[PDB]
Design an enzyme around this catalytic site. Structure first.
Site, PDB file in Angstrom:
ATOM      1  N   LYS A  29       0.509  -1.021  -0.390  1.00 36.26           N
ATOM      2  CA  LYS A  29      -0.572  -0.331   0.092  1.00 36.26           C
ATOM      3  C   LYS A  29       0.651   1.409   0.173  1.00 36.26           C
ATOM      4  O   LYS A  29       0.521   2.280  -0.385  1.00 36.26           O
ATOM      5  CB  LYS A  29      -1.012   0.126   1.151  1.00 36.26           C
ATOM      6  CG  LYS A  29      -1.816  -0.776   1.225  1.00 36.26           C
ATOM      7  CD  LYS A  29      -2.118  -1.482  -0.906  1.00 36.26           C
ATOM      8  CE  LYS A  29      -4.652  -2.155   0.039  1.00 36.26           C
ATOM      9  NZ  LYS A  29      -3.915  -3.169   0.781  1.00 36.26           N
TER      10      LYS A  29
ATOM     11  N   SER B  25      -1.772 -12.702   4.715  1.00 32.11           N
ATOM     12  CA  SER B  25      -2.698 -12.730   2.925  1.00 32.11           C
ATOM     13  C   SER B  25      -1.353 -13.491   2.172  1.00 32.11           C
ATOM     14  O   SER B  25      -1.804 -13.727   1.105  1.00 32.11           O
ATOM     15  CB  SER B  25      -3.064 -11.473   2.608  1.00 32.11           C
ATOM     16  OG  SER B  25      -1.816 -10.467   2.611  1.00 32.11           O
TER      17      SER B  25
END
Length: 310
Positions: A41, A271
């Site tokens: 991100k 993840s």
């Protein structure tokens, strides 16, 4: 070179071949934990701010507002500090002290919303704050902002192409905003012209991409794979470039992330375990025997120390 501030240092993350996953070294992972604020991100934090500067929606003195405490919140926080913006992030009062502390350390104005309201309460508050003075506040909207997949098209995708000498055959990426798989796939298929297999990964507990594409009722559900499985199809998921969708369960994601640590010496987030578990399943199909599979590992282990991961 020397980066003018920490936002410009994003990306250039390494590819590492797995030894205990795949068949004959066909699985390679891209370590997005190696970034200014230690996740994928960071790229979108940087580019959403930069694009809003270029289009004039973000100016000196204007303030950033959002409702994320996850990797995007942390990314926006470091970028705001690096580029001299105030930022407000809204979140449930029941958020971890670790996450509050990290965000307060980065100079964020945390607005704690009502615990009994969850994320919805935080999102509504962020929307309310902005509506109270729209000339003062900018909400960057990571699920729809094209600057999200664009930075992946400009950086993440080209890095994969370059470091594999164009040999990448398959990209495997978990879908949160969809920006990663979207941008990478546009780069490789459209800019470099290679007909790869783009594989989206989602929780078996909330398999809304699978259900959507099957024309079945969309039934989101709870899961523990942080950073993916938003429970809707985000605007920044380009379904047109997705070839395949793999589902992975939370236990298997966690077990895989643990195996990455213990067996490969890769400090992967939850993840990341999900993405690799999906990639390993493709990698052990004869059809992918001689094919180079590149997997995005969105984040690093230490961000998950008080979670089920440890």
């Amino acid at each position: 070179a020397i980066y003018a501030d920490n936002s410009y240092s994003i990306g250039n993350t390494p590819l590492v071949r797995l030894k205990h996953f795949g068949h004959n070294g066909n699985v390679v992972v891209k370590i997005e934990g190696r970034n200014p604020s230690y996740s994928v991100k960071c790229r979108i934090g940087a580019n959403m701010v930069w694009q809003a500067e270029k289009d004039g929606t973000l100016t000196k003195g204007k303030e950033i507002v959002d409702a994320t405490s996850g990797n995007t919140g942390i990314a926006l926080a470091y970028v705001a500090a690096a580029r001299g913006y105030k930022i407000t992030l809204t979140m449930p009062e029941t958020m971890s002290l670790e996450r509050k502390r990290l965000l307060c350390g980065l100079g964020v104005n945390l607005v704690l919303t009502e615990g009994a309201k969850g994320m919805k309460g935080a999102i509504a508050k962020a929307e309310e704050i902005v509506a109270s003075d729209p000339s003062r506040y900018v909400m960057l909207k990571q699920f729809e902002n094209p600057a999200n997949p664009q930075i992946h098209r400009e950086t993440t995708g080209p890095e994969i192409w370059k470091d594999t000498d164009g040999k990448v055959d398959v990209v495997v990426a978990g879908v949160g905003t969809g920006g990663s798989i979207t941008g990478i796939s546009r780069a490789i298929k459209l800019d470099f012209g290679k007909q790869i297999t783009s594989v989206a990964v989602e929780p078996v507990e909330s398999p809304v991409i699978s259900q959507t594409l099957a024309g079945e009722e969309v039934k989101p559900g709870p899961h523990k794979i942080q950073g993916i499985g938003a429970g809707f199809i985000p605007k920044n998921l380009d379904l047109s470039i997705i070839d395949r969708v793999e589902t992975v369960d939370s236990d298997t994601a966690l077990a895989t992330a643990r195996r990455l640590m213990a067996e490969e010496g890769i400090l992967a987030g939850i993840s990341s375990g999900a993405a690799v578990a999906a990639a390993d399943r493709l990698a052990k199909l004869p059809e992918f025997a001689d094919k180079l599979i590149v997997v995005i590992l969105p984040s690093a282990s230490e961000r998950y120390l008080s979670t089920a991961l440890f």
